[PDB]
Amino acid sequence: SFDRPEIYSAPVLQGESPNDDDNTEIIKSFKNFILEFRLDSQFIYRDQLRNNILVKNYSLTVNMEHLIGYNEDIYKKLSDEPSDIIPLFETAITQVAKRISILSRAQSLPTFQLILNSNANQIPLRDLDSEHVSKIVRLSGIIISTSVLSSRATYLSIMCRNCRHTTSITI
Amino acid sequence: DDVTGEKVREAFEQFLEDFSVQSTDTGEVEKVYRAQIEFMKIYDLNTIYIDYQHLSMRENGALAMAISEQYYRFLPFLQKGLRRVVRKYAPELLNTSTERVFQISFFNLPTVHRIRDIRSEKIGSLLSISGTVTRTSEVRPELYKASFTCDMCRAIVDNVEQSFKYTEPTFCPNPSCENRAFWTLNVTRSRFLDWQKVRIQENANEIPTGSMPRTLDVILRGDSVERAKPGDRCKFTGVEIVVPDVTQLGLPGVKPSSTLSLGVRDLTYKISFLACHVISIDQEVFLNSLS
């Protein structure tokens, strides 16, 4: 006849220094890149994200070569193992979007999607090798068949049929 | 491997041969260790008595101090050195006729520690104790070296050393197996020694003011089993040893614990003793032990 016990947490003292490979540092660098990239003395990405929030388009279109100037190392990490770093930059976009929405509320948001437009060299389709596996590549060609929209689950509520135990897994 | 262990082992086996104590006027000088080896071959025994005074005399006692302070660490090196010495001179007694275990016993230590003098900093070292025998248990076998039957490719691995605790053979009779999940021990290829636990008690004259008597558990491994009857004052010489204890679970003080997964294990122990040998303190046999 007792409530479930909570588990708090709090930062108290500066521990070991945050490494560059640390995911939180990656997210911080990505957030700063979103918030401080200047082209023609204009905050292109900040304003683009603000408009995307306004038009209810929860996505961001980040030019790929614009990223090499801000941080060549993080661009190398992105182009090396995208399947691990890309969710981190999506998370950074989501955090910045939450901040912007709450700030501009004065007169919840889902996980944002990142769209990468690049102008780099395009690998011919025949030229794809074993090396490119799990590496971002640029391809060109003609679209012949587009399938039917298939619905996939991003957040679905489950319940143990006997235990009547609700739970919510996120994919 | 360790260079220091090799050095101490080679020095050990060196002075098992080079050592020679004088016989004064009668007998000139003779190799006492070689004489004891010849005695061993003659009587086909299994334990060699080494005086600590001779080791102290040799090489300014640096090796004596090294072997007294870290007896447990150098013990396998001592066994290997003695085996090589036996191979050099009279290697006939090497085998049981599979292999005969040679026991090394040190006697005549400079000092005697009472039961109340046991200290943690002496753990694993060589020393002597003097107590009164209270309880003696049965002579029971213990797994000197343990053999087992394999799980996949059912077959028996032969003559694998058994440590202080249960061990699993990493290697397999079939080299392609490399599976060790389920081992089935076989007594035939498993060696054994003699095990007997004797509960000694502090003598009356050593008891401090007010303290009730204190007692220690002493394990006799080897030929020294059943060498002391209950109620006798005996001098025990051996190595200070520790054994895991599960009773001290609620005692004051932080309990040491190991984390590994989780891999939790409470590191609680109690002090015991492993004695190399025991010394107590018709008319023909009686007539013989007189001057």
């Binding site: 409530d3 479930r4 509520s157 135990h165 609700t166 | -």
Partner: protein, 103 residues
């Protein structure tokens, strides 16, 4: 199983710690309902029991207003269903738990 005579489909008793939407729940004592429950053991009456033999006893489950209606050592006439409870070891782990539900 005790609080109802007919065997109901066994639904495990899970205490709701969180809302259906994941919100934390604070249990409200003083609004939840509690029922008094007492078990008494009835032994063969000494006046009628055979002399020199061990006694036999049955367990009675009382509930709600029937609790604390007796004192140990009383002579009582409890009437109720002689229900049998539990799988009784038939399900893999010597008879069945038998008790008189109190009416």
């Amino acid at each position: 199983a005790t609080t109802t005579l007919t065997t109901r489909i066994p639904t495990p008793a899970i205490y709701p710690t969180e809302d259906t939407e994941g919100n934390k729940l604070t249990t409200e004592y003083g609004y939840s309902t509690f029922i008094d429950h007492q078990r008494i053991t009835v032994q063969e009456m000494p006046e009628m029991a055979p002399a020199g033999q061990l006694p036999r006893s049955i367990d009675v489950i009382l509930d709600d207003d029937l609790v604390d209606k007796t004192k140990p050592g009383d002579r009582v006439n409890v009437v109720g269903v002689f229900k049998s409870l539990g799988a009784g070891g038939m399900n893999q782990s010597i008879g069945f738990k038998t008790l008189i539900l109190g009416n």
